[PDB]
C-alpha cells in the first residue's frame, strides 16, 4: 500500500517539479526549459528515467529539481516492485 | 474585459524615476507571467523584463542596460516597474502583457507613454 | 539569444491579394514562434500561436506555417484593416526574444 502512497507523492513532485523547473530555468540564457507544458513531458522522462535530452536543465537549481525528479522516479518504480515480489511471496507461500 | 490597465502617461524629469503600474483582471494563475515591452517611437518591440507574481522571481533583459526593476501586489493583483534615472533614450512606450507560461504573450495592455523631459 | 530576422521590412500588395511575411530564426526553435499584429498607436495583438495556431477573434484570413528555422505569417486576401507592423516572437529559448517587424502596404 506505500506503493500507492508512491505514486501519489510522485505526481506531486511530477508537478511541482515542472514548477520549479521553469522558476529555476528562465533567466539563464539558452536554456529551454521555460514553458510549464514541455516542463512536466520534462520532468515524466526524467523520472521514468528515460530521459531523451529534447529538454535538459541548465541551471544549478534545475539540476537539483532534476535530481529529485529522478528519485521519486527510480523509487516509486521500486517500492512497485519491491510491493509486487511481495504479493507474489505471499499468493504463492501456498 | 480590458485585463491589463495602464496609466496613459508620465512625465519624468531628467535623472528622476517613475514607477509604471499595470492592474490585471480577469483569469489570474499561480503560473502568470507578467512583461515588460518597450517600444521606442517608430522601432520594434523591446523585451524588458519578467516576473513571476505566484513567487516573486524578475528576470531582465540581459543585453540592455538595466534600468528597471519588478515587483508584484501578491493581493491587488498589480505588477509594478522601477524605471530610475532616465534619460531622452528611455522616453517610449511601455506595455505589459500576461504570459500564462506557454510562451506567448496573450493580451497586452494599452501602454504607458513615458516622456522624459524638463 | 535566439535571433528573428524579419524580411523585407515592407510589403506593397494589391488589395484582395495573397500575402506573406516570413521570420528567420537563428537557430532551431521548432515551432516555437508566434506573430503579433500592432496597428497606428495601438498595442500588439496575437495573431497566430505556435507558427500555426488560431488564436480565437483572428479572421480565418490569417495562417501560420513553417518549423525549424524557417516561417511565414500569411494574409489571404489583404485588406484595409490588415494595413499594420508584424512582429514574430520566439519562446523556445531565454530570453524570450522579438523581430524587427513588417509594414504591410496595400495598393489602392
Known amino acids: 500500500r506505500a506503493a500507492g502512497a508512491a505514486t501519489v507523492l510522485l505526481v506531486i513532485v511530477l508537478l511541482a517539479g515542472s514548477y520549479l523547473a521553469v522558476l529555476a530555468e528562465r533567466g539563464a540564457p539558452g536554456a529551454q526549459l521555460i514553458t510549464y507544458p514541455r516542463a512536466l513531458w520534462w520532468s515524466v522522462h526524467t523520472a521514468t528515467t528515460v530521459g531523451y535530452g529534447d529538454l535538459y536543465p541548465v541551471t544549478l537549481w534545475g539540476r537539483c529539481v532534476a535530481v529529485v525528479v529522478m528519485v521519486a522516479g527510480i523509487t516509486s518504480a521500486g517500492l512497485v516492485t519491491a510491493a509486487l515480489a511481495t504479493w507474489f511471496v505471499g499468493r504463492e507461500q501456498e | 474585459q480590458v485585463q491589463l490597465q495602464q496609466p496613459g502617461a508620465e512625465l519624468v524629469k531628467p535623472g528622476a524615476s517613475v514607477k509604471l503600474s499595470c492592474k490585471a483582471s480577469?483569469?489570474?494563475?499561480?503560473?502568470?507571467?507578467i512583461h515588460w515591452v518597450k517600444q521606442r517611437p517608430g522601432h520594434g518591440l523591446e523585451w524588458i523584463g519578467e516576473?513571476?507574481?505566484?513567487?516573486?522571481?524578475?528576470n531582465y533583459n540581459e543585453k540592455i542596460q538595466k534600468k528597471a526593476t519588478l515587483t508584484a501586489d501578491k493581493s491587488s493583483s498589480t505588477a509594478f516597474m522601477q524605471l530610475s534615472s532616465l534619460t531622452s533614450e528611455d522616453s517610449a512606450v511601455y506595455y505589459c502583457?500576461?504570459?500564462?507560461?506557454?510562451?506567448?504573450?496573450?493580451?497586452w495592455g494599452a501602454g504607458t507613454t513615458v516622456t522624459v523631459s524638463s | 539569444d535566439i535571433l528573428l530576422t524579419q524580411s523585407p521590412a515592407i510589403l506593397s500588395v494589391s488589395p484582395g491579394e495573397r500575402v506573406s511575411f516570413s521570420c528567420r530564426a537563428s537557430?532551431?526553435?521548432?515551432?516555437?514562434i508566434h506573430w503579433y499584429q500592432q496597428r497606428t498607436n495601438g498595442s500588439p495583438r496575437l495573431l497566430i500561436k505556435?507558427?500555426?495556431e488560431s488564436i480565437s477573434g483572428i479572421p480565418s484570413r490569417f495562417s501560420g506555417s513553417g518549423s525549424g528555422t524557417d516561417f511565414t505569417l500569411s494574409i489571404n486576401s489583404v485588406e484595409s484593416e490588415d494595413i499594420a507592423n508584424y512582429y514574430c516572437?520566439?519562446?523556445?529559448?531565454?530570453?524570450?526574444?522579438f523581430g524587427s517587424g513588417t509594414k504591410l502596404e496595400i495598393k489602392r
Open positions: 480577469g483569469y489570474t494563475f499561480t503560473s502568470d507571467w
Open positions: 537557430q532551431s526553435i521548432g515551432t516555437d
Open positions: 505556435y507558427a500555426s
Open positions: 502583457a500576461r504570459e500564462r507560461g506557454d510562451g506567448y504573450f496573450a493580451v
Open positions: 516572437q520566439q519562446s523556445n529559448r531565454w530570453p524570450f526574444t
Open positions: 516576473i513571476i507574481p505566484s513567487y516573486g522571481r524578475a
